[PDB]
Structure formats: structure tokens, C-alpha cells
Amino acid sequence: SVKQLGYLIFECRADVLEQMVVVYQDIIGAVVERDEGGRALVRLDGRPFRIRLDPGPANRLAAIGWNVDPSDLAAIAEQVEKACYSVVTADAELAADRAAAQVRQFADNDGFTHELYVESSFPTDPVLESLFVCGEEANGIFGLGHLVVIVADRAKTQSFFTDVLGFGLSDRVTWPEADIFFLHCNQRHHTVALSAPALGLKPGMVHHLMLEAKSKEQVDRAFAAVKRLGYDVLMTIGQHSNDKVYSFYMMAPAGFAVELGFGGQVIGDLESWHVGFYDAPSIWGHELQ
Ligand SMILES: [Fe+2]
């Protein structure tokens, strides 16, 4: 199965790109490097990038990078093809662009581009690693965070993630406004969550992205920074009922929410995880506006 969410690549209009650098660098506290082409490489560990912003004519999620073990790549790609998505082999330039040893790409019916990839080695970055839960940790494999997406047909997409990509269901959170399905592929409580269309959102939209700090104080600081820098909060500090994350949400200029959280529930043993069910998304806090 998929090992972890290894990278995300977004395209942004020129002004939106510069504004997103503020989000990642000056609120989230990630390291953001710039290259010769004006790209922004958002780093949370030793990897050259975990999130990359590329200039483009429209704001969109351009690629989702699913890291897989070398021994699983060909096999997973085969199951994707059996599910009737065409899988193309990336050339050397594309693989190197992703800082990956190999990449196979496909697009789904919801308009997302997926890339199954084998990782290239990269050095440790002790300072940065002390700040974010990302990739390989002492207590397991986590990837970079989670992505929550809106899709036309939740059940079908859930079946693809589950039966093709090898994700397991963590829990379902259901209340009058929404019905969300949280999926894991490693220690992180969820790497992806799925919803059908709802007030606001349409198939193929990103609901939010989440990054995970290694201390509660990072979250409080970032939250203060949103306010101090004169921005607006989407959801105030709170704790989710399912993942137990201490987090807040902000609306980013690229048109989706960004969540910074702490203390996410770990899936210790995937084989014995019990699917949970919750009637409310939060224990306390998380006040809209
Ligand atoms: Fe989240």
C-alpha cells in the first residue's frame, strides 16, 4: 500500500504565490526556499520540499505525491490500471524535478493528479525536524500532514483509496452539516479525508490541508501571528473529537483552509485499528469565525 503523503505541488497566480509564502514561513514557521524560477519550496524536514508552489495562470492543486516502497510501486500501479486509470511513467526530468528516484502518474475522475513515487535520499535537518511531525519519526511513519478533499462520489473514491491504494478507514464524523470519512495509511490518524459536496464546496475542491507542529506552543504562537499580522481566523483553537488534534484553521489566499495542529492521535497498529464513529467534529473550541 501507499507509505505516506510525501509531497504536494500547487500552482498559484503570482500574487497568491507570494501571499502563501507568508502563510508557510511567517505563520506556520516552515522553512521556505526560493529557486531560479520563483518557485517556493516549503520544507518541514530534510526533504528538498514537502509542499511546493509553482507559478501558474490558475490556483490549483497540481500533484499529490504518494510515497511508496520500491517493492510496492509496480504492484500498486498495476491495481490503479485495473481500476481503469492510465498510469504513465515519468521521465528523468520529471523524477528529478520531484526530487524522486521514480514517479508514476495518473489522474482521477475528481480532477486530482496522483504521483506514486520512490523517495530519493536526503540529509537529516535536526532543527527543522524538531519542529514538525513529518515523514519518518521515532514513533512511526507520518508523511507531511493530511489533505481533505471534496468529491462527487464519496463511496467510490473511498473504495479507490481503500481497495487500490491500501488506505484503512480511521473513523466517520457525522453531523447535520457534514459526513466526513477519515483514512490512514500509516501512523498519522489520517492522511486523507473525504466528503461529498456541501455548503460551499464542490467536487474536486480542497477543503483543507493540515501540518503538525511538535509543541502546543507552536500552535499558540502561529495562532497569535494570524491575529497580530492582521489576518482572520477561520476556526479558533480547538480539539477534534476523532484525531484529538489541538489546532486552529485559517483561510489561505489560494482558496482553501490551512490547519496547524498538535498532539494528533497515533495509529499504533493498523491491523487492529477500530473504525470509530462520532456525532460531532470537536470536543471544545474550534469556533467558526
Ligand atoms: Fe484536519
Q: Which protein residues have a CB closer than 5 Å to ligand 1 (ion)?
A: 210, 259
Residue type present at position 184 = H
Rg (CA), the chain: 18
- Compute the distance from residue 146 Cα to the ligand 1 centre, in Å: 7
1-129 matches 130-289 in fold: yes
- Compute the distance from residue 234 Cα to the ligand 1 centre, in Å: 13
What cell was used for 125? Answer: 535537518
Q: For the sheet with 235-240, list strands across it.
A: 276-278, 168-175, 178-184, 192-195, 146-150, 206-212, 257-262, 246-251, 235-240, 282-285
CA–CA gap between residue 52 and residue 9 (Å, rounded): 5
Question: Residue with C-alpha cell 499558540?
Answer: 220
Q: How far is CA 250 from CA 6, 209, 229, 233, 278, in A?
A: 23, 10, 13, 5, 24
Give 144's Cβ-side CA count (13 Å radius).
Answer: 25
Q: Name the CATH topology of 1-129.
A: 2,3-Dihydroxybiphenyl 1,2-Dioxygenase; domain 1 (3.10.180)
Please give the torsion angle defined by the CA atoms of residues 4, 66, 272 and 75, in that order, rounded to the nearest 10 degrees. Answer: -130
Q: How far is CA 68 from CA 1, 21, 214, in A?
A: 7, 28, 25
- Compute the distance from residue 25 Cα to the ligand 1 centre, in Å: 20
Question: Residue with C-alpha cell 507570494?
Answer: 18
- Compute the distance from residue 14 Cα to the ligand 1 centre, in Å: 27
Q: What is Dmax (Cα atoms) for the chain?
A: 51
- Compute the distance from residue 224 Cα to the ligand 1 centre, in Å: 19
- Compute the distance from residue 53 Cα to the ligand 1 centre, in Å: 21
How far out from the chain centre does Cα 159 lie? 19
- CB–CB of 265/287 below 8 Å? no
Domain spans of the chain? 1-129, 130-289
- What CATH number was assigned to the domain covering residues 130-289? 3.10.180.10
- Compute the distance from residue 89 Cα to the ligand 1 centre, in Å: 32
